[PDB]
Amino acid sequence: AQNPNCNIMIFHPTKEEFNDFDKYIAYMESQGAHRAGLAKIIPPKEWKARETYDNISEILIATPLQQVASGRAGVFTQYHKKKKAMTVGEYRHLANSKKYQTPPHQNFEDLERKYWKNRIYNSPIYGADISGSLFDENTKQWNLGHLGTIQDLLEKECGVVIEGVNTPYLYFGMWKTTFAWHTEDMDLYSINYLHLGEPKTWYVVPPEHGQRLERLARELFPGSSRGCGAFLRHKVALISPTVLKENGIPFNRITQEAGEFMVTFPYGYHAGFNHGFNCAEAINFATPRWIDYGKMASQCSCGEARVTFSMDAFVRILQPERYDLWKRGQD
């Protein structure tokens, strides 16, 4: 078995290998990359997402989200308070202000220490989940707006034609902006490209050990656990690396820098934070190996998790028994 310790692997494809996306994901899995739950892909040196980022300040963040924490430093939840719209130029300026800017630090490890120590005492603002793309239409390789769709994958694998569409999302981050512990909708893959700015630190649990994280979470967030059998679908809970280590939960960490791709694999729980002002683009995708994960994916029926139009068909075809109760949660 390849990569039996479930280490995060880093790949350096050549320009020739960067042509066929599906084939390169399949190659990474042949080398056991999926066991970690997360892989890094450094693009060939000849590749570019677009010519420059000089012209992005007029993108609108219609609903910036202030991420307010409750709990203790290593075990907290966050809720998102809606703020007034602002442009990417206005957001960048806010991120760089004395109130919100990254503090002086030695290195990524020092900054990671400061994050886990101090996150709860601040409420950074996140421009998350903005439909759109920063890939130039002429970028032919690893263009996240031109991938094969999850609906066409399900159709190719299972023969059923379904409604729905699959498009990317932009995330504009600042120091301490945080993504809570989660897997993707229907335990899909995700791919994330860091277009510009400061780094993003990731934590990940190997898919084979996901249930260990869930059990810990039920112990640490006992009210939430009673409220919903899949409350991590709410995407609000954080647990620090120190707390994971104290409870024997297997995990790994890695920092993504501008120009790098990250791939999360089916049922790979992940969480993390941004180091300063940045812009990432991400999208869900599928492969034939996903289908079995989609059939077994947990679902939130309590009404909190509330997701996209396109998840309907996935639940309806892959999880017909669950569909009724889940749709009651959606309405």
Ligand SMILES: O=C(O)CNC(=O)C(=O)O
């Ligand atoms: O970048 C973020 O805030 C969150 N991204 C992801 O969870 C992902 O790409 O799967």
Ligand SMILES: [Mg+2]
């Ligand atoms: Mg603009």
Ligand code: NI
């Ligand atoms: Ni994710």
Ligand SMILES: [Zn+2]
């Ligand atoms: Zn729920």
